């Protein structure tokens, strides 16, 4: 069994790739996005426990072993997962394949396969071994499908255009090969006998042929552009729609730019499939027709032209890898420089304050020098490639003219025939050049295709649920939690065993120490996530049995870190609910005290808001959030004062709103400050992911629990 290495599509997923690589090595090909989901790859990184759990879930018998400096000992299962340190900067996971006498084979998912000297690796690695072995439950299979053939589906409806492009290209080639015989007719016939009338006719004939050729080129160029855009739009929009249908787990796992990188590579997928389809259709025939014509003209000169192509093929294929290695190394060193410049610019207050203007410059200079060195090495490789291609092409041209003249002198072919042969090389070399220059595009295309298709195969949020919505239409009722444990990924559980009881139409407050666990307990109630151990009951009915649509439509969540999309204030206020009458919006708007600042905006209600309401004040932005919430007319209203200033000008307007609710609808407030919540009915204290004590303020203070100590620590 040959060594297999899985490449990193994202930056964070290191251990996922290693487990997938070993999984492939034993003969179980699984989608890397699914293994990412199994291991629980957070934005921080992958825990070895996460890898062991994910392995144990696949049926691999595996254990985490503290690395021993003496690893030359035989009876340890190979391969094993050992976590190395990349140049004393970040923690990295790498796959050990064979520890030889002194050389260690390590199929680094960051960069292909590499072999380190025992003493070197032993200096690099932390040492944290994960030893895996298939134990009956493991079964060999192929669960990933070829996504390149899946993305070929968008070429099915555009058959006519492809065939039209194919005919246009074929007829262009035919007029090209027909038009290239002008010099022969010129040198052999017309100039020899000095015919004028015929010359004047033939000149126009070839001129008209060329004018039809450039017209077909123009028509083809328009159709290939239209086809390209159409497939590009189709793929990009198909991907975007699928992402939105995925659960919050997917969006917690990954970063922002990590999701939009797919949008940027949707172009190169389409570009590759589109180019490759057309190339194979119009060049594999063009090259053959050209080659046949040359083989007909003269054998010796064709076999010289074959050697020229062969040598060009070998030079490109041998130089293909180092250029990509240098390219990657430049993009790394450039990313560090631009990061350093941003970091240096963001905190110039500090640099100025400390008078460190010299050190930061010296640091930046060293990072520029590094980029220049990397740039120069890539430049040198391009110069070397350019020069050698130059040598082959030029010597090819001279030696063909030499051999040609020799064959003409010997009386094998006529004079003009050599110039016609020299003309036809244009229509023989170009196709095979274009055909050989396609392999790097295809390889990076198949990478992108897999990178994108893996995300398109993920189970949408709607499909993960089964409901019984006709059984319970209304929400309104007592909200309770039973033994509700919760963990974000495969790390320490944020919430342990919890028991709650929220009676209908009472302002219940959840106070605590950890903001994460507090905001998590709200986000859980809406059913963004699902708790592993325990369940949540609304009106004596499990949330898992209620409609997702109704749940999210009937519950309002007002966070202090509110988001505002760039649009019209009026439209922005009632996003997601169209056919809403202004008469409601203006009634709701009053409750938040929108008007007071809305009237002072240049246009009353159709003010174009700046990106994330930049122009709008934080206080102003909140009032819009409450106005958005009250427009919904919900059964549960979940407030948040988490990661807040609490200026005490907004609290009055929150009280004005909460009084303005005017229904038997539940209000859940999550404010760390005890001064705001004293008026509430039941104050629940979240301590280390556990509800310790529950009840009214007076009772909680009278009982002298943890709340008493916190309240005495307040004032």
């Amino acid at each position: 069994k040959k060594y297999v290495c899985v490449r990193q599509y994202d930056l964070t997923d290191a251990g996922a790739a290693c487990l997938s690589s070993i999984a492939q090595y034993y003969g179980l090909k699984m989608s890397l996005a699914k293994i990412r989901e199994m291991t629980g790859t957070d934005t921080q990184g992958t825990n070895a426990y996460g890898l062991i759990h994910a392995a144990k879930q696949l049926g691999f018998s595996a254990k985490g072993v503290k690395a021993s400096k003496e690893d030359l000992l035989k009876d340890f299962r190979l391969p094993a997962i050992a976590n190395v340190i990349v140049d004393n900067r970040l923690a990295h996971f790498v796959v050990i394949y064979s520890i030889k006498n002194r050389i260690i084979t390590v199929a680094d998912p960051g960069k292909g396969i590499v072999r380190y000297s025992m003493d070197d690796f032993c200096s690099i690695w932390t040492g944290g071994l994960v030893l895996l072995e298939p134990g009956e439950a493991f079964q060999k299979g192929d669960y990933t499908q070829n996504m390149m053939v899946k993305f070929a589906g968008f070429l099915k409806p555009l058959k006519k255009t492809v065939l039209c492009i194919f005919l246009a290209s074929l007829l262009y080639t035919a007029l090209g090969i027909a038009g290239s015989f002008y010099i022969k007719f010129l040198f052999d016939d017309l100039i020899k006998f000095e015919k004028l009338n015929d010359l004047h006719i033939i000149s126009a004939g070839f001129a008209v042929i060329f004018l039809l050729q450039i017209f077909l080129n123009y028509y083809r160029s328009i159709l290939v552009t239209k086809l390209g855009m159409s497939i590009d739009k189709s793929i990009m929009m198909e991907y975007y729609s699928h992402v939105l249908k995925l659960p919050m787990n997917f969006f917690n796992s990954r970063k922002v730019g990590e999701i939009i990188s797919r949008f940027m590579d949707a172009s190169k997928i389409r570009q590759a499939i589109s180019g490759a389809t057309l190339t194979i259709m119009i060049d594999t025939i063009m090259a053959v027709i050209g080659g046949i014509l040359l083989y007909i003209q003269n054998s010796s000169l064709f076999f010289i032209s074959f050697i020229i192509i062969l040598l060009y093929g070998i030079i490109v294929t041998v130089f293909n890898k180092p250029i990509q290695n240098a390219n990657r190394q430049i993009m790394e060193d450039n990313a560090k420089l631009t990061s350093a410049l941003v970091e240096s610019v963001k905190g110039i207050e500090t640099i100025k304050s400390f008078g460190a203007e010299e050190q930061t410059e010296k640091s930046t200079r060293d990072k520029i020098e590094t980029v220049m060195k990397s740039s120069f090495k890539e430049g040198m490789l391009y110069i070397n490639l350019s020069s050698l291609t130059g040598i082959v092409a030029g010597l090819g041209g001279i030696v063909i003219l030499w051999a040609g003249a020799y064959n003409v002198i010997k009386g094998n072919m006529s004079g003009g025939q050599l110039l016609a042969f020299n003309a036809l090389l244009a229509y023989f070399l170009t196709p095979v050049k274009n055909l050989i220059d396609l392999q790097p595009l295809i390889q990076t295309a198949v990478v992108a295709s897999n990178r994108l298709g893996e995300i398109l195969e993920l189970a949408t949020e709607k499909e993960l649920r089964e409901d019984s919505d006709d059984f319970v239409i209304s929400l309104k009722g007592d909200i309770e939690f039973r033994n509700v444990d919760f963990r974000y990924g495969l790390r320490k559980p944020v919430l342990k065993n919890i028991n709650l009881t929220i009676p209908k139409g009472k302002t219940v407050a959840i106070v605590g120490e950890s903001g994460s666990g507090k905001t998590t307990l709200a986000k859980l109630l809406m059913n963004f996530y699902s708790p592993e151990k325990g369940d949540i009951l609304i009106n004596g009915h499990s949330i898992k049995n209620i409609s997702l649509e109704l749940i999210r439509k009937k519950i309002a969540f007002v966070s202090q870190d509110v988001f505002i999309f760039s649009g019209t204030v009026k439209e922005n206020l009632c996003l997601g609910n169209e056919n809403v009458d202004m008469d409601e919006i203006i009634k709701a708007a009053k409750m938040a005290n929108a008007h007071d600042f809305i009237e002072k905006l240049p246009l009353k209600y159709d003010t174009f808001l700046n990106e994330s309401g930049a122009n709008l004040s934080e206080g102003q932005k909140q009032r819009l959030a409450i106005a958005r919430a009250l427009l919904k007319k919900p059964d549960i209203l979940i407030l948040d004062e988490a990661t807040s200033n609490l200026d005490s000008i907004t609290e009055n307007h929150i009280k004005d709103a909460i009084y303005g609710l005017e229904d038997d609808v539940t209000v859940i407030i999550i404010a760390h400050r005890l001064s705001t919540i004293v008026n509430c009915d039941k104050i629940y204290l979240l301590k280390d992911g556990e509800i310790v004590e529950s009840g009214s303020h007076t009772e909680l203070i009278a009982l002298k629990g943890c709340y008493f100590k916190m309240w005495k620590q307040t004032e």
């Binding site: 992958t46 825990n47 070895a48 426990y49 985490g64 072993v65 503290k66 932390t126």
Partner: peptide
């Protein structure tokens, strides 16, 4: 096996792509 064992916490302590 024949190596120094680890606790489920220290399995949770090892990180990949983090500091």
């Amino acid at each position: 096996n024949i190596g120094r064992e680890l606790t489920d916490e220290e399995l949770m302590e090892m990180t990949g792509g983090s500091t």
